[PDB]
Design an enzyme around this catalytic site. Structure first.
Site, PDB file in Angstrom:
ATOM      1  N   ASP A  35       0.818  -1.214   0.000  1.00 26.75           N
ATOM      2  CA  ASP A  35       0.000   0.000   0.000  1.00 26.75           C
ATOM      3  C   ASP A  35       0.853   1.266   0.000  1.00 26.75           C
ATOM      4  O   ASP A  35       1.337   1.690   1.048  1.00 26.75           O
ATOM      5  CB  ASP A  35      -0.910   0.012   1.234  1.00 26.75           C
ATOM      6  CG  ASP A  35      -1.836   1.222   1.270  1.00 26.75           C
ATOM      7  OD1 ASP A  35      -2.000   1.895   0.229  1.00 26.75           O
ATOM      8  OD2 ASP A  35      -2.405   1.494   2.348  1.00 26.75           O
ATOM      9  N   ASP A 222      -1.457   5.513  -5.300  1.00 28.58           N
ATOM     10  CA  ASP A 222      -1.929   4.709  -4.171  1.00 28.58           C
ATOM     11  C   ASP A 222      -2.293   3.280  -4.582  1.00 28.58           C
ATOM     12  O   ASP A 222      -3.403   3.022  -5.050  1.00 28.58           O
ATOM     13  CB  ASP A 222      -3.148   5.397  -3.549  1.00 28.58           C
ATOM     14  CG  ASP A 222      -3.642   4.713  -2.291  1.00 28.58           C
ATOM     15  OD1 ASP A 222      -3.103   3.647  -1.920  1.00 28.58           O
ATOM     16  OD2 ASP A 222      -4.583   5.257  -1.675  1.00 28.58           O
TER      17      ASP A 222
HETATM   18  C1  0GO Z   1      -6.873  -3.149  -1.791  1.00 29.04           C
HETATM   19  C2  0GO Z   1      -8.102  -2.316  -2.232  1.00 29.04           C
HETATM   20  C3  0GO Z   1      -9.401  -2.829  -1.556  1.00 29.04           C
HETATM   21  N1  0GO Z   1     -10.586  -2.049  -2.002  1.00 29.04           N
HETATM   22  C4  0GO Z   1     -11.733  -2.843  -2.512  1.00 29.04           C
HETATM   23  C5  0GO Z   1     -12.957  -2.329  -1.728  1.00 29.04           C
HETATM   24  C6  0GO Z   1     -12.608  -0.830  -1.712  1.00 29.04           C
HETATM   25  C7  0GO Z   1     -11.124  -0.860  -1.264  1.00 29.04           C
HETATM   26  C8  0GO Z   1     -10.987  -0.971   0.286  1.00 29.04           C
HETATM   27  C9  0GO Z   1     -10.721   0.457   0.804  1.00 29.04           C
HETATM   28  N2  0GO Z   1     -10.254   1.145  -0.394  1.00 29.04           N
HETATM   29  C10 0GO Z   1      -9.653   2.488  -0.396  1.00 29.04           C
HETATM   30  C11 0GO Z   1     -10.742   3.588  -0.556  1.00 29.04           C
HETATM   31  C12 0GO Z   1      -8.722   2.698   0.780  1.00 29.04           C
HETATM   32  O1  0GO Z   1      -9.093   3.384   1.731  1.00 29.04           O
HETATM   33  N3  0GO Z   1      -7.493   2.102   0.715  1.00 29.04           N
HETATM   34  C13 0GO Z   1      -6.483   2.207   1.784  1.00 29.04           C
HETATM   35  C14 0GO Z   1      -5.865   0.809   2.095  1.00 29.04           C
HETATM   36  C15 0GO Z   1      -6.871  -0.300   2.445  1.00 29.04           C
HETATM   37  C16 0GO Z   1      -7.966  -0.084   3.327  1.00 29.04           C
HETATM   38  C17 0GO Z   1      -8.862  -1.140   3.620  1.00 29.04           C
HETATM   39  C18 0GO Z   1      -8.674  -2.417   3.037  1.00 29.04           C
HETATM   40  C19 0GO Z   1      -7.587  -2.637   2.157  1.00 29.04           C
HETATM   41  C20 0GO Z   1      -6.691  -1.580   1.864  1.00 29.04           C
HETATM   42  C21 0GO Z   1      -5.387   3.249   1.399  1.00 29.04           C
HETATM   43  O2  0GO Z   1      -4.340   3.331   2.383  1.00 29.04           O
HETATM   44  C22 0GO Z   1      -5.959   4.663   1.135  1.00 29.04           C
HETATM   45  N4  0GO Z   1      -4.876   5.654   0.965  1.00 29.04           N
HETATM   46  C23 0GO Z   1      -5.261   7.068   1.206  1.00 29.04           C
HETATM   47  C24 0GO Z   1      -5.663   7.320   2.673  1.00 29.04           C
HETATM   48  C25 0GO Z   1      -6.975   7.766   2.968  1.00 29.04           C
HETATM   49  C26 0GO Z   1      -7.354   7.997   4.312  1.00 29.04           C
HETATM   50  C27 0GO Z   1      -6.433   7.788   5.364  1.00 29.04           C
HETATM   51  C28 0GO Z   1      -5.112   7.345   5.090  1.00 29.04           C
HETATM   52  C29 0GO Z   1      -4.126   7.132   6.265  1.00 29.04           C
HETATM   53  C30 0GO Z   1      -4.042   5.650   6.701  1.00 29.04           C
HETATM   54  C31 0GO Z   1      -2.715   7.734   6.014  1.00 29.04           C
HETATM   55  C32 0GO Z   1      -4.743   7.112   3.735  1.00 29.04           C
HETATM   56  C33 0GO Z   1     -10.422   0.447  -1.539  1.00 29.04           C
HETATM   57  O3  0GO Z   1     -10.080   0.784  -2.666  1.00 29.04           O
END
Ligand code: 0GO
Length: 380
Positions: A35, A222
């Site tokens: 990530d 990302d």
């Molecule tokens: C593997 C993809 C799984 N997919 C499939 C379902 C949607 C999701 C899960 C959550 N997500 C995004 C909207 C997300 O929040 N990713 C997280 C990682 C993640 C969350 C949950 C499950 C799997 C992976 C990422 O880190 C965001 N970066 C910016 C961001 C936004 C807000 C706060 C932060 C802090 C942690 C720094 C970063 C997706 O795209």
């Protein structure tokens, strides 16, 4: 060696790309989501219905409890756990072991994904966005400090249409993973991997917005987000353009909200009625840029559910954002992306698993020159 690191990723854009890691002594093997959009290293550390295995701290003689708790809310999904340190390795990465911060996840909500085959997350971004605060050293920082590994890594994420899911090369660039030129965009600020978009076209048509709108309130690269996420104003214009181009076909209610599937008879997906999206990224030289071009094979994400497998079904992989642009996994797919931390820049090249059909291809092209001298950055 780089060749030993090739094809060390599995997974897909919809559920995440993961790499094998070990934690503890003796080593406990876990699959870990890669990530670039966060900065905490965290692993399931207690039973959960979706967890196939988890980190057992009591069985590691090298574990140290930091006696501090941590809570991390993402855009969607959250977890809470206890911080500690332990020895960490990547079996198909660099041939080293380092001591790193690890959050032991003991409670979570909509974080773990059923059938995803990963049990933790590796936040590869910078300390500024680490939780609880920037004093918690991220994994890659620890790796560089404790070893001679050069301060950069690269990702080649490969889709289902073009098992192995891709490569994470730590410490260098593997030329066998891309063709053509590598084009670099500056990292604006070291927190997320923040970059600047200077122009957007949909099927060659400029969206003609003030370029600051494309980066409201930041743009990031990302790998832990599936979709291309766009600021409201930009999302609306993009959807309008894609709708207009594809207007020979009628799409379900909810398709454009990224919720509902559209399906075509096997092999008959009308790729041609969907436009290409060009994102122009700020170049290394004043007012120069390069573009990456995104095909519908990228932003229409295939679903692999066995139940739907008689046809080819897709979700619309572009979402509205209230926290800026996110160039997520479907955008990175087909490109070789170099996170050159040492030189504060991100490189893009066409990858060996690049997306194309007989008429169109994903591309990285430049240089382009712009006359207007406005800083497209939203923040200074
Ligand atoms: C593997 C993809 C799984 N997919 C499939 C379902 C949607 C999701 C899960 C959550 N997500 C995004 C909207 C997300 O929040 N990713 C997280 C990682 C993640 C969350 C949950 C499950 C799997 C992976 C990422 O880190 C965001 N970066 C910016 C961001 C936004 C807000 C706060 C932060 C802090 C942690 C720094 C970063 C997706 O795209």
């Amino acid at each position: 060696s780089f060749v030993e690191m090739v094809d060390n990723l599995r997974g897909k854009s919809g559920q995440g790309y993961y790499v094998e890691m070990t934690v503890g002594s003796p080593p406990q093997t876990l699959n870990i989501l890669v990530d670039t959009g966060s900065s905490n290293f965290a692993v399931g550390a207690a039973p959960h219905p979706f967890l196939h295995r988890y980190y057992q701290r009591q069985l590691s003689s090298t574990y140290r409890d930091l006696r501090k708790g941590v809570y991390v809310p993402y855009t969607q999904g959250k977890w809470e756990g206890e911080l500690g340190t332990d020895l960490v390795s990547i079996p198909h990465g660099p041939n080293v072991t380092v001591r790193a911060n690890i959050a032991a996840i003991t409670e979570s909500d909509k974080f773990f994904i059923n059938g995803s085959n990963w049990e933790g997350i590796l936040g590869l971004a910078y300390a500024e966005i680490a939780r609880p605060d920037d004093s918690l050293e991220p994994f890659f920082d620890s790796l560089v400090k404790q070893t001679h590994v050069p301060n950069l890594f690269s990702l080649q994420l490969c889709g289902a249409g073009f098992s192995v899911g891709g490569s994470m090369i730590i410490g260098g660039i593997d030329h066998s993973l891309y063709t053509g030129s590598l084009w670099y965009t500056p990292i604006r600020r070291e927190w997320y991997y923040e970059v600047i978009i200077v122009r957007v076209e949909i099927n060659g048509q400029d969206l003609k917005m003030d370029c600051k709108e494309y980066n409201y309130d930041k743009s990031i690269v990302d790998s832990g987000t599936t979709n291309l996420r766009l600021p409201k104003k930009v999302f609306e214009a993009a959807v309008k353009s894609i709708k207009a181009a594809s207007s020979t076909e009628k799409f379900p209610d909810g398709f454009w909200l990224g919720e509902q599937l559209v399906c075509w008879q096997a092999g008959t997906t009308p790729w041609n009625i969907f436009p290409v999206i060009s994102l122009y990224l700020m170049g290394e030289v004043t007012n120069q840029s390069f573009r990456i071009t995104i095909l519908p094979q990228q932003y229409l994400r295939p679903v692999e559910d066995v139940a739907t497998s008689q046809d080819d079904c897709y979700k619309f992989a572009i979402s509205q954002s209230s926290t800026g642009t996110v160039m997520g996994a479907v955008i990175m797919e087909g490109f070789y992306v170099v996170f050159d931390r040492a030189r504060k820049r991100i490189g893009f090249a066409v990858s060996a698993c690049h997306v194309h059909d007989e008429f169109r291809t994903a591309a990285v092209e430049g240089p382009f020159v712009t006359l207007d001298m406005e800083d497209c950055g939203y923040n200074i």
